[PDB]
Amino acid sequence: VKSQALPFMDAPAPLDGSMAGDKGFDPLNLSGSFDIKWMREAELKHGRVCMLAWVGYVAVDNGFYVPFAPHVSSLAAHDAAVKAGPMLGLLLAVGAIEAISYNAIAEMMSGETDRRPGDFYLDPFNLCSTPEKLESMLEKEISHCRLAMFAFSGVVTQSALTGGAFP
Amino acid sequence: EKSQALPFAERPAKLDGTLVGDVGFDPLGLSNILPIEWMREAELKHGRVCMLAVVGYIVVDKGLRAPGAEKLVAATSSFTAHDAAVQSGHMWALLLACGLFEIVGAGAIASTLNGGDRKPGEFALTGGFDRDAAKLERFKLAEIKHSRLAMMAFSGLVTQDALSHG
Amino acid sequence: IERGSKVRVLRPESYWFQECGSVATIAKGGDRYPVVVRFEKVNYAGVATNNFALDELGEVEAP
C-alpha cells in the first residue's frame, strides 16, 4: 500500500508483505520491473557472502590463521592466497555450488519447484519448525544480510584507505 | 482571458491557478510543451537548492566553518572552497548523499507523473505543519515565492562575488 | 458472367490467368464450367478458347 520508509508514495506491486524484511522500500519500481524472486535470491546471496566476508576479515586481521598460511594482513591476504594457490581451489569449490545454484534458480523461476529464494533446505537442527519460527528466522536473516553488506563494505573500504589495525 | 502578470498577453492554456503561485506568466509557452508536474518539481528543487546555497555562501564567507573544516585549507572566501573541496575529495561525499536522495526524488517524480497524486515537491518531511490544509497551502505559496526570490538572489550573490574575484 | 462481356480469368492454372477474354456462350445446367470464354492470345497448345465456371471469372467491362 502507501509504502513504509517512503510515506509519500506506494510500494511497488510485488511488495505486499509477502516476504521477510518487506519494509516497503523500492522507490524506483525496480522489483515490479523484474521478478522479485531473483531480487530476493540476489539480496540473500550478497548478504551471506558479506557475513562470511566480514567475519573472515575480522578473524584474519585479529590473527586467526590456518596450519599453513602466508601470515599477512587480510588486505593483502587475497594476493598472498592467490599466489599460493588455494584461492583458486576455493573458486572451484564455490563454482560447484554456483552451478547447482544455476539449476535451482532455473527451476524456482520456471515453476518446476516451489523453492523460496535463498532456500537450499539446509536445516540440520530443524531451527525452522513452525511457520512462526520460519518468518522470524527469515526476518533475522535478512536484517543481518543487509547489515553485514554494510559492515563489510565499510570494513574493506576503511582497510583499503588507511591500512591500519582491525578497526 | 488575459494573464495576471501580463494583461496585454493571453493566458497560457495549462496555467489555470491549480498550481500555487500561478499568475499566468509564460510568454514562451514552454508549459504547453513540457508536462508541468516535472516543471513544478524542478521549480521546487531549484528553489530549495538556491535557498540553501545562499545561506551556505554567506555563512562560509562570514567565517563559520564546519567541524574539522579548518583543515580543508580553503581561502575561507567560499569562492575557492569549491576547488579546495573537490581537490580534497569531500564534495564526492556530497555527491553521494545527493544521489542517494535523488534516487528517491526520481521515484517520487515518477510516481506523481504516473498518477500517485503526490504534489510536486512533497516528500513527507514536514515538521508537523501538515495539520491544516489551508496552512499547508499558505506555506506552499510562501515556499514558491521564496524560491523565485532565492534563485535570483544566489545569481546576484555569485555574480558579484565573481566580479570582485575576492 | 454475361454473353459478349469482357471477363478476367481467375483460374490459377489457366494460361490466361489474370487476363481478359470475351464470353461467347453460357450453357444451361449440366456443365460444371458453363461459360465459354474466347481469347485472342493462343496458349502453348494453340487454342484460344476454353470453358470456365462463373466463379473463375470476374467481369471488367459489360457488353
Binding site: - | - | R8, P12, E13, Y15, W16, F17, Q18, E19, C20
Partner: protein, 92 residues
C-alpha cells in the same frame, strides 16, 4: 586508361557517352512501345507485328525524341505500368 569513377575531369570518358547512349536507347524503346500500343488497337495486331505500318512507324520514331517527358507523363497518368493484378502469372 579510362577513369570511370564519376570525377568531372574525366567526364568525357564515360559520363557523357553514357548519357548519349541512355537517351538513344530510351528513344528506341519508346518508339517500340508506342508502336506496340498503336498496333494492339489495330484490327489485325498479329499481322501488323510482321508488316509494319511504316507511315505511322516513322511518326512514332520521330515523336520518341521527347521520350523522358512522355514516359513521365504516362507514369503520372498511370498508363505505363499495368497493374500486376492484370498480368499472367504462373501458379506460384
Amino acid at each position: 586508361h579510362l577513369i570511370a569513377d564519376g570525377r568531372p575531369d574525366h567526364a568525357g570518358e564515360f559520363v557523357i557517352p553514357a548519357f548519349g547512349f541512355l537517351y538513344i536507347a530510351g528513344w528506341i524503346g519508346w518508339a517500340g512501345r508506342s508502336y506496340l500500343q498503336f498496333s494492339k488497337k489495330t484490327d489485325k495486331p498479329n499481322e501488323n507485328e510482321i508488316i509494319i505500318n511504316v507511315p505511322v512507324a516513322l511518326g512514332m520514331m520521330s515523336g520518341a525524341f521527347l521520350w523522358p517527358l512522355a514516359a513521365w507523363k504516362e507514369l503520372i497518368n498511370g498508363q505505363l505500368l499495368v497493374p500486376g493484378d492484370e498480368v499472367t502469372v504462373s501458379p506460384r
